[PDB]
């Protein structure tokens, strides 16, 4: 139950460590 990772899933949403930047936490 993180929050972090809900950056993540942003992140992975926004494609992940193919979109530019990688992974958040």
Same mark, same amino acid.
């Given at each position: *139950?993180? *929050?972090?990772? =809900? %950056?993540?899933?942003?992140? %992975?949403? *926004? $494609? $992940? #460590? @193919? @979109? $530019? =930047? #990688? #992974? #958040? @936490?």
């Amino acid at each position: *139950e993180e *929050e972090a990772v =809900r %950056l993540y899933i942003q992140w %992975l949403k *926004e $494609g $992940g #460590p @193919s @979109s $530019g =930047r #990688p #992974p #958040p @936490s």
